[PDB]
From a paper:
With over 300 known variants, [name] mutations are the leading cause of mitochondrial disease linked to a single nuclear gene4.
To further explore species-specific differences, we assembled chimeric [name]γ complexes using mouse [name]γA with human [name]γB (mAhB) and vice versa ([name]), then analyzed their conformations by cryo-EM. While R conformers resembled their wild-type counterparts, E conformers revealed key distinctions. The DNA density in this conformation was weaker than in mAhB, suggesting reduced stability. Overall, hPOLγA, when paired with mPOLγB, adopts a conformation more similar to the complete mouse enzyme (mAmB), whereas mPOLγA remains partially resistant to structural influence from hPOLγB during proofreading. Strikingly, mPolγA paired with hPOLγB exhibited a reduced kcat compared to the complete mouse holoenzyme, while hPOLγA combined with mPolγB showed a modest but steady increase in activity.
Residue numbers in the entry:
A (entry chain B): 41 to 110, 116 to 127, 145 to 169, 176 to 192, 203 to 296, 304 to 330, 342 to 458
B (entry chain C): 42 to 54, 72 to 126, 145 to 192, 204 to 296, 300 to 328, 345 to 363, 366 to 395, 398 to 457
C (entry chain A): 70 to 250, 262 to 313, 347 to 498, 530 to 624, 736 to 773, 779 to 993, 1049 to 1233
The structure:
Amino acid sequence: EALVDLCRRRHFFSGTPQQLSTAALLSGCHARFGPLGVELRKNLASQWWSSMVVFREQVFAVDSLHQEPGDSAFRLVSPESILENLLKTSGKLRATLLHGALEHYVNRKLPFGLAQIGVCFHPVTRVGEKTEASLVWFTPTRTSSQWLDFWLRHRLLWWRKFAMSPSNFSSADCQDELGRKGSKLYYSFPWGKEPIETLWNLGDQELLHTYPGNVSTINVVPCVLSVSGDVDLGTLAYLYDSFQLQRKVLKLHPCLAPIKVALDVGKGPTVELRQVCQGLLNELLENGISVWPGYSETVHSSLEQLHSKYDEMSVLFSVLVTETTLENGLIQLRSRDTTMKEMMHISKLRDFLVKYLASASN
Amino acid sequence: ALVDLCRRRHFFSRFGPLGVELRKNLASQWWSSMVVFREQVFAVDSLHQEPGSSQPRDSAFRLVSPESLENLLKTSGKLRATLLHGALEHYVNCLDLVNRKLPFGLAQIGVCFHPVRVGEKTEASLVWFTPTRTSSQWLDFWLRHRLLWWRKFAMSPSNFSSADCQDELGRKGSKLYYSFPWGKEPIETLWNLGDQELLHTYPGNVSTIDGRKNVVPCVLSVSGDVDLGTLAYLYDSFVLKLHPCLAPIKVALDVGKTVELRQVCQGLLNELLENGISVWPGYSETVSLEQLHSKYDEMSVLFSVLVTETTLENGLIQLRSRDTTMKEMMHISKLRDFLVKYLASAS
Amino acid sequence: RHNPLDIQMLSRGLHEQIFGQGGEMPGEAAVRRSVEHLQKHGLWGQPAVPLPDVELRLPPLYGDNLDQHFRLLAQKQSLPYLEAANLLLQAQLPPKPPAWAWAEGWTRYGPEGEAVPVAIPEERALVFDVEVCLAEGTCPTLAVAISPSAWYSWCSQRLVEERYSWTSQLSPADLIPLEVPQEQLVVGHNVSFDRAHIREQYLIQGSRMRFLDTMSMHMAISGLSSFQRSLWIWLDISSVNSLAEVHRLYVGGPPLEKEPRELFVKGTMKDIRENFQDLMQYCAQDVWATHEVFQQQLPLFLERCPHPVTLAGMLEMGVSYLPVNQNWERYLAEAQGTYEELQREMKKSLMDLANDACQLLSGERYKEDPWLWDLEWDLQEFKQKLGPCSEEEEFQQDVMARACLQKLKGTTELLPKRPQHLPGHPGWYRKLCPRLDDPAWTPGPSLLSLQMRVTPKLMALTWDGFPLHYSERHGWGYLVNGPYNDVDIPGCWFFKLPHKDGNSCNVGSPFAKDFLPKLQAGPGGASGPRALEINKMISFWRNAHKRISSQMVVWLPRSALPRAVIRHPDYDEEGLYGAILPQVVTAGTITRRAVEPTWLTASNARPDRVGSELKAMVQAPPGYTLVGADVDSQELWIAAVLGDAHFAGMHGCTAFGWMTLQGRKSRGTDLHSKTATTVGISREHAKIFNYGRIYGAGQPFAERLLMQFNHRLTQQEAAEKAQQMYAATKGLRWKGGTESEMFNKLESIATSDIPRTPVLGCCISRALEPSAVQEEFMTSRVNWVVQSSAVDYLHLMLVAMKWLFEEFAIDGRFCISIHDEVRYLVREEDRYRAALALQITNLLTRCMFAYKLGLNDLPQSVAFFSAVDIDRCLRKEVTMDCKTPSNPTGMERRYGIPQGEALDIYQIIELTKGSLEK
DNA sequence: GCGGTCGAGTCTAGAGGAGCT
DNA sequence: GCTCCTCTAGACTCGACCGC
Ligand SMILES: Nc1ccn([C@H]2C[C@H](O)[C@@H](COP(=O)(O)OP(=O)(O)OP(=O)(O)O)O2)c(=O)n1
Ligand SMILES: [Ca+2]
Ligand SMILES: [Ca+2]
Ligand SMILES: [Ca+2]
């Protein structure tokens, strides 16, 4: 079975089969990510945000509107007023977050960064939207090449960190219209390599057409590196990479998997076991471990199908609370990677999960 | 006044960096309390633009490609005004997820575009697909639960209020309120729309549009303004005593009484960040202790940590609390556990 | 412009000013025999297109012939240094002073033992020995030296002052200053260690001080081959390279005391600061032994190496100099980072293989896996010993659930004191996965590694499509060195993995260095083959990262860089420039071939080898060009002209000489391609086999090598192949082979009473003469003849190039001679004058080699360098971009090194108008 | 009192040389 | 063709300690 069929069945992907085409996926004109896909994309954005603004000094946060003031960008025309006046004063949707970052330039050291995650609109004319995570890194002119090289390898290491096969995340070199230098990350999708992330060593030009007035506002007038990764395309890259391209399992990184614990109840008595499982679920959630309540599911299925379903959904750990749990506290914990069943005591379960999820992230 | 304090401390720009962090915390609390803790409530992702209707009565701005006027109101997409219509298109999408077991919920925190120019507000919408007979019961349940949620993080839960009103079609609904200093502004609103709303988005077969029987749910919409909600929590908390589960910055490290202290602070900061505690690295600042106290109070920092020469001699770090403004001494290895325990107990 | 064999000899413009006017013409019988020999192999009657003729005004050759010209050149070169060697040979030395001075610089003690403040020895001859504490750093600690009528000592500031603020950055201000601010000779045992710790030798401009090594002269006089070294641990006339054994062999008497208190290999700063007065005494006695053995060796060396070219080349072969820049630290940092990253990737692939291997437990599927069937899969058991709800009801249900959970969490009274360790996992897994209670626990098989007896089963390694199997009795083999019957695997034949020590040993790691050329991951899964690719990528840096990372780089500041760098616009104030002075012994073998493990290697940059661009990291400073010219088939041509001189008086009279001269690689008519076509092997292996055959390696060596390169070749088939491959070239004794006269001359000049190199006349080692060793080590002597002739070729090249550089004032310097390559660090303006100088040096060297053999002629083919690579970083071709797993973007993209131009003699003449004047 | 478990001890194969440290 | 030195890491064996 192809990956996209799996990610559509297990709600990583949403949309009609006419929207599951490669061009439709890579264009962004339809809501492609199902619930689990949105949760995985949120995990990816969280990893990006922590590793780039929290674990990283001199990088900050930026808020930008979905409308650039005053190109192929779509225009916002008020139907109350409804051609010459529609292209001079009408607002325009943003195509990249770079111009939003340059608006928050100071609002006084160097180097620094202005990282942001948001939605950008792409002509496809239809309208396509992609979630872009942009780091706009300012450097003195001399160090720009060195900082570009450092950002290229750091971003490549970050993208390969969660990757089962780090070799697929390739890199290259490119030049833009004005001859500026820049690199371009890739992922070797089965059809071909796509630029999940690009870096452009934008010169002094960018601060000129966003601050065309006094130059004291923009003491070296810094360049711009414009690191911009596509987290929708990145999420699809990690959905293709986790699949082996046996047992169908999305070997997603424990820091990216949407569902980490999958509780369940063995047999009768139903009321006591379900009360215990609810208490355990409340215990897990307080620390911050994302659980999938499988005990409340009225659709009953064999253990094999349940385990296969949890494998496909990239569930790290599967917990079973049987009637014997009421006596001593032994719950038959199972792990996705090995598929081997433990008999861990209740008091150790939460601590073991926290320790595992702290070792995986470090 | 409060506006000056929010402006200087990066809460007001609208939302400064601390304001955006507080809004992110508020959205995360909403998400947890309405999706994670709450059963059968899921996430919905939908595009910002709408397919585009033929009715000129809509005030939503249209999307026109510059590469191409009476046809601009026919086949040109428009920006969404409310998240309600986006949720209704995922009804089938999340129907199989719950195995078509009513009731089930859809939640989403996105951007809504309303004509002010074009204005953008961050609306956190809960759309509940309840059967018709239990419509008012679930409506009152959600009303009281949302009122409790909004009062929980507030120092003064009396300012938050609720009231009723009626829709254009005579449909009954409840509106939550916050008593702003200039007067009540509804930060949330609940309507009992009924099966009519689901009828429009699914004009086709009825079977795809509650015990063993299946009925078209009496779709009621719970929509809250987390931008106006963040404004309400900034007004109410006024020194800003924001909630520990909402405050943007938990810990403010520093130094006092050099390179060894720098490394100690670096290790402490790295441990705190690895655990998951947001920290303000005040040791990296360019340069009084009372001024730092005032600054961390205005920024709503729960605890100010001071690392001094004694931290090398004894391993004890001075800890100051925003709530009590008193000094405490603790060993470095037990600061992380103390902070985690305090955050867990605050929730 | 032609010879009796239609081979286009040198043009009359050059020949009339190189060889003799009258000369001598080969007789009718000689020419007839040569033509018969050429026509017997079919090489006679295959004319080739003529190269365009060259008209140059060569520098006026001194003396009468080439031989006198060289002799005068080498005498003028090595005159002031042989004088210093003689001064040191006969001298009177005061006794070692009882005490030493705890100064900061140089110290000298004479008859009075006065505390003389010295900064420079100010002497032309100083035996030397530098002492460096290995643990603290490569910076010197102290050194004791002797000049005639003096005793010297210098101790670093790292000892006189006890502060620990010492950086890993190395600058010449931390080293031993010897040279004065003219000619000098500095002597020692393994001087390449001393020179690397000298300050004035880390400078881009050349130095007028030359270094002579007692180990090198010993290896020339009475050295031992590696087999003879093994047999030694002729016995009374030779010794091993160690100072004590050499002193016992030459001087004898009271043995040198090897200190068991090794306060320099496993000691600290304090261990030396305390036993200073005893470590200096040991160093002083080492210096005394070196001086005594130098006295016993120098007359022997000058007797056994009479030609001044030998000593001059040795004095210039040992001043190698490799410049570097700040990209060396980037090379090391990126190579180590990529090594660690690929090690993590390989470990994660191994853990993933293990995780995918557990699932064989389900249903006991492991019993059919060809690799994991014999592991321990045992299991252990645990032990022990409709509507909403009101707020009040919701609170009550929450409290009840939490209370039930807390009640359940109190039953720990039955669990055992010591928790079990993963009883649900199979037996072989619990070993891999760490203890759940460890303070450094990580999930999964976090202890898995390549060296374990599991990894070549999780990778499912297949040797020629055969799974790898381990037996305690025999070692790592495979299942289908013979079918051992100790192993009783049902239906399989346990063939051991071939080992470099034969079939009497055991193999414990199929990831050893010997197995790199061969061995692939088997069934599905893209993590096994990826792990093997990671292993092959890292192998080089794994086995040689200690040496490369520990190379004693010294970064010069702007206070010592030449003006031809600061003014050059490519120079940046934020880059550190320096050099690496390779620690190479000038005569490290019986051959006198220089030996060094890292720099002097045949390995070059590859797209499948981490850190393999190390030579490409020798980047000339801004303004300098690494003008160099790999000698086009050096040793093959040397052996060819030897055979030509033996057979007749003209080039090409032997089939080997024709193939070397008239054969071309484009048509596959040269020696290597002809051998490959006749046998059916690749050119890379044919090159190794041919160069080994030129060294006198016997037929059994060829049989074993053919078995090794192609394991499908049996013993009998390899024997037949090697016999046919040697009969066509060596011949039957020889006569009837293309190299009959070549090998006959080699054997005749190796079996003489005192074997000599036919060009310079240097003598073979006393341990290999027919009197001392009788008729033993024929292969060693035959190899020595050709390889020492090649060393004589290098000596002639160095003498000629130094003469050309000094006469015409070329701002150059010898850089390195990696095997046959010869690189020069010439300034950018002189890159064409230096190219012409290298062409003239090649011409004169070939003419000298032919003249000392009596050929008295030279073909136009070999008269000049094919291409003098003008470049800025060492590399085989100027078009290479040096893409490696540690350098994915290439050389030009990453390090900003533009490609250079591989010129030619005609282009050089057109650029320089044929004249080397300025 | 006794079967399981754990920390050396011994052995062997490989890897830097057969020189300087 | 044939050995030597030390340093490191993986595996079988051994007795000594301990909870049932
Ligand atoms: N089996 C071998 C092969 C090579 N060498 C060394 C000694 C020679 O000095 C040098 C010769 O290498 P070349 O670069 O001259 O090889 P070719 O030029 O013949 O290779 P090709 O003509 O294929 O480029 O290599 C050696 O000692 N033993
Ligand atoms: Ca020495
Ligand atoms: Ca010594
Ligand atoms: Ca060559």
